[PDB]
Symmetry: C3
Subunit: 314 residues, 3 copies
């Protein structure tokens, strides 16, 4: 199989700066090469340079709208672009609002996809709900159909087309959800697994379930949008919003691991890494490798080992 990496050095989805340095640190952590070490061919597409929207106005509360609308428009494009060639898209990112882009682009070639969302937050707030115009906390509200026309069309996201219903999305790692968001997920009946569910079933069953629930009938392609923050802060400290009591490195590596073991991975998102939001240099480095590690997980590497087949190591 083939792998193409897209860098989404962006950050207007939120205030704290650095997230665009995300793909910059990830490649520096040698993400590309290690990936090559697998059975997958890897092509690095570089960093989609994003033209800045002069005089971007705050649509009511929502900020830097046009920016996030055009930046995400440019991305979805490249994604659908690769997706058609048949390669697996892996979006190194800045804030998690590049999810619309990625996800959209993906749905163009595979409109039957599901979505596993590992984030501490649902990020399912709308321009109406959000107590901030930080679109990095709305990505699902743009991709959801059951939410279309449920809020004033936003300046820059015209090209966006609600592509999936709540019956194809699955959240894992939720532990910091806003009122409005809780409403939405309950109302629209969205299958999720808050830390409390993790706690109850155990990552194993959590994954086991989520799968049947999504690939029970028709096996479709998967889009794992992973938010480096959905792990506990002790593991991925260099982030925008940390939230104690989250997924463990182990649990996180278990997810990408069961994901891989299903061969249905199509699109991958490694968002929210802020190479600057480090209390200490280590914390960053930590955050960086664990992230890196989580990628190579989705692409083969098992915690039990790997050995090139047909070769007699004896």
């Amino acid at each position: 199989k083939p792998i193409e990496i897209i860098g989404a050095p962006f950050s207007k989805g939120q205030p704290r700066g650095g997230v665009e340095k995300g793909p910059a640190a990830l490649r520096k952590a040698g993400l590309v090469e290690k990936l090559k070490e697998t059975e997958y061919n890897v092509r690095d597409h570089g960093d989609l340079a994003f033209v800045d929207v002069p005089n971007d106005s705050p649509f009511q509360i929502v900020k830097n709208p046009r920016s996030v609308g055009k930046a995400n428009e440019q991305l979805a494009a490249v994604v659908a672009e690769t997706q058609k060639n048949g390669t697996i898209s892996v979006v190194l990112g800045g804030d998690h609002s590049m999810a619309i882009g990625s996800i959209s682009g993906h749905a163009r070639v595979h409109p039957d996809l599901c979505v596993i969302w590992v984030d501490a937050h649902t990020d399912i707030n709308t321009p109406l709900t959000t107590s901030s115009g930080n679109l990095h906390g709305q990505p699902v509200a743009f991709l959801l159909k059951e939410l279309k026309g449920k809020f004033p069309d936003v300046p820059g996201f015209s090209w966006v087309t609600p592509c999936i219903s709540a019956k194809d999305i699955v959240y894992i790692g939720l532990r910091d959800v806003d009122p409005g968001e809780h409403y939405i997920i309950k109302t629209l009946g969205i299958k999720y697994f808050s830390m409390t569910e993790v706690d109850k079933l155990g990552i194993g069953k959590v994954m086991e379930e989520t799968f049947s629930y999504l690939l029970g009938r028709k096996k479709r392609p998967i889009h794992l949008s992973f938010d480096v923050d959905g792990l506990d802060p002790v593991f991925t400290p260099a982030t925008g919003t940390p939230v104690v009591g989250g997924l463990s490195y182990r649990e996180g590596l278990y997810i990408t691991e069961e994901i891989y073991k299903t061969g249905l991975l199509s699109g991958l998102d490694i968002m929210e890494v802020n190479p600057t939001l480090g209390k200490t240099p280590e914390e960053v480095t930590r955050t960086v490798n664990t992230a890196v590690a989580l990628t190579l997980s989705c692409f083969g590497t098992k915690r039990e080992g790997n050995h090139k087949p047909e070769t007699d190591y004896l």
Copy 2:
């Protein structure tokens, strides 16, 4: 429902000083207000000032007896006092020996209550057993009937009336139990779940069980005496006795969470917080919020979110 908070700034139950600063730090962490943010009405009762017993003699080995006898006598009173009005009692505390007070006061209005004891220790030692007169390690021995007249009446605890048998008490998080104590719990057949049990079943099943075992037949009121030290030291470092390999923040939040989801909470104890026993300021702060967090847990807050009902956030 209504909530009344009682501060038990005390510490003679043990040597290390600071535990009385407990309710002092907890309120400072804004425990009161956050609580108001729920569906419960909250009334802060303040800190029961405790008159000191001049010349308190060490009953054999047991120390500061009269102190702990009168301090706990004053408390039980206020507790039964609120309990009658129908509000939920929440005892911010100093050492865990204010459990007799709280628990007693509670049993006066609801003598059919059970008790969930999250502590690293059983604290079920008697004046006979204890290798210390630290009554913060005997609270159950005073409340237990099967232990009445099993030791020399203690100077100051006359007013104390063994209120519950081993069939209504449940320990969770035990990992540092003394010989004598092991004897007692086995002999008197006390349902418990040592870390090893936690390890085996998984907090989920651990709670699931404990409930049936207590609320299987007659659903009664619950008295969760939570000992901030039953969590692992990495989570609640600012304590008297830390004991590695204990409950995780997650597991601890899972408990208070399943407790809440049963609407049977009547009395709550947040003991053993020593705002001074911090290797570093953070450790305290850590200890403080996690504690605070554990309270608001027992009162609604879920790790999946909360949203005021009947309001359309759309």
Copy 3:
């Protein structure tokens, strides 16, 4: 029952020095006395002084061969020596290559034994595979029959006799396995439980299984070769190779605990402790006690308590 402790202050199995100081720190942590506190009689055998092999040549890639061959020859001997008297052998160690010695010596008296291997690594590499002559990463390859004559006889391990097949060995905690090693374990069909398996089943089921798989038919003696490094680095930092995302103190204490509860413990290995590889003095101390703790676990101590029988603590 009787316990005899053997100190294997050795380290040529690998580069980093200090591991021979292993038994030196363990006794200093009072391992001997605490052990006496159990229902087992304990005899400390002291530290097998190891005569150094002048001019030890690097068999191709493999280093300090003759050293590790004679040091392990001297050990197996003492082990079989005690094993015959009926006492339980407990090898405090230096690098994990003293496993051949221990294990061999054990098989002499009980050739029907199985083996539980808690290590981050399989250490099942051969002189052919290893990208290092560090025999501390080959111990199983010398003890395995299915591997005999699968590599050039090594200078110093003549006396070694492949004693067990892959049907009697069980690995727990694997998370850093080399290519060649993966080949071997898959090929030779070796029952294991990588962190991912731990993650899936939960230490409880992991142990529950491993047992039936080994003691299902004929109950035999157990040889728990525990590698202090198989726990997460946060717990046992003072080691040669740390590997993030490993067994928790709890999970590790759960293992030795279920091991003990089967009364089938015959030989115990507490390897890879490097009293010098400590970022800070605490880290060592940490590493030391947790190790110590893991021993006393295999010998009675439960996390629920212990009380001398036939004594009325009332």
